[PDB]
Amino acid sequence: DPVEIENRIIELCHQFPHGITDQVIQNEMPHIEAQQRAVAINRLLSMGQLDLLRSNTGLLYRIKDSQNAGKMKGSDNQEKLVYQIIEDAGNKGIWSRDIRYKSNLPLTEINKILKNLESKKLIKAVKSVAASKKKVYMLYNLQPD
DNA sequence: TTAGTATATGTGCTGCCGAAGTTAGCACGCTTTCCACAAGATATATAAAGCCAAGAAATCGAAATACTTTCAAGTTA
């Protein structure tokens, strides 16, 4: 059952937040073929709950960041669809204008998202000393460059 | 040492399309923040009338019966 295969893969991803490899998936479920496992992984990547990483050991399939929530009001869709580039920037930070241009969302919407994230302690706003024009948003856990 | 060969040497050729310059005589006619200074938002008479929305009473509109008229067919003659 492909639904059961996807559920088991999601459970394995939950158990291993750092990601799982095809070897681990096969060791956990050896009675299923590599073709079925690949079809399940493709369906998961198409529906958008897993992300692929290329490490020196091979391929890793990690559950998308959804448990860490700072903006639950409305929908987690925009929350994660902003946190993606927020994390991508991370140490270097990113201005509000750049966040708006990358999200293609209204200024009011992005401001609400940022305010909710700051209220739930997921992002920190720091004044850019190089160009004191706007405040860049970074991850609360990362050290400011 | 000398004839054959490769190179650059400036030169001189070709097109290359474009460059300046031309075309004659009158009368009409937005964003971030950041910033600082002063302006909401506040009690309080206070007389005054006009306004804008619940209730209570009133009367208009008219509908379902009660009178009179009217036929029309039938009676005492």
UniProtKB/Swiss-Prot annotation:
Top-level taxonomic group: Eukaryota
Coiled coil, from the record: none
Subcellular location: Nucleus
Signal sequence, start to end: none
Impact noted for substituting residue 37 to W: In IMD101; uncertain significance
Job description of the protein: DNA-dependent RNA polymerase catalyzes the transcription of DNA into RNA using the four ribonucleoside triphosphates as substrates. Specific peripheric component of RNA polymerase III (Pol III) which synthesizes small non-coding RNAs including 5S rRNA, snRNAs, tRNAs and miRNAs from at least 500 distinct genomic loci. Part of POLR3C/RPC3-POLR3F/RPC6-POLR3G/RPC7 heterotrimer that coordinates the dynamics of Pol III stalk and clamp modules during the transition from apo to elongation state.
Assembly and binders: Component of the RNA polymerase III complex consisting of 17 subunits: a ten-subunit horseshoe-shaped catalytic core composed of POLR3A/RPC1, POLR3B/RPC2, POLR1C/RPAC1, POLR1D/RPAC2, POLR3K/RPC10, POLR2E/RPABC1, POLR2F/RPABC2, POLR2H/RPABC3, POLR2K/RPABC4 and POLR2L/RPABC5; a mobile stalk composed of two subunits POLR3H/RPC8 and CRCP/RPC9, protruding from the core and functioning primarily in transcription initiation; and additional subunits homologous to general transcription factors of the RNA polymerase II machinery, POLR3C/RPC3-POLR3F/RPC6-POLR3G/RPC7 heterotrimer required for transcription initiation and POLR3D/RPC4-POLR3E/RPC5 heterodimer involved in both transcription initiation and termination.
Family: Belongs to the eukaryotic RPC34/RPC39 RNA polymerase subunit family.
Domain remark from Swiss-Prot or TrEMBL: The [4FE-4S] cluster-binding domain adopts a globular structure that serves as an interaction hub that connects the POLR3C/RPC3-POLR3F/RPC6-POLR3G/RPC7 heterotrimer to the Pol III core.
Disease (UniProt): Immunodeficiency 101, varicella zoster virus-specific: An autosomal dominant immunologic disorder characterized by reactivation of varicella zoster virus (VZV) infection in adulthood after primary childhood infection with VZV. The viral reactivation manifests as central nervous system vasculitis with stroke-like episodes and lacunar infarcts on brain imaging. Features include headache, hemiparesis, impaired balance, and other neurologic signs.
Protein name per its UniProtKB record: DNA-directed RNA polymerase III subunit RPC6
Interval of the full protein contained in this chain: 14 to 158 of 316
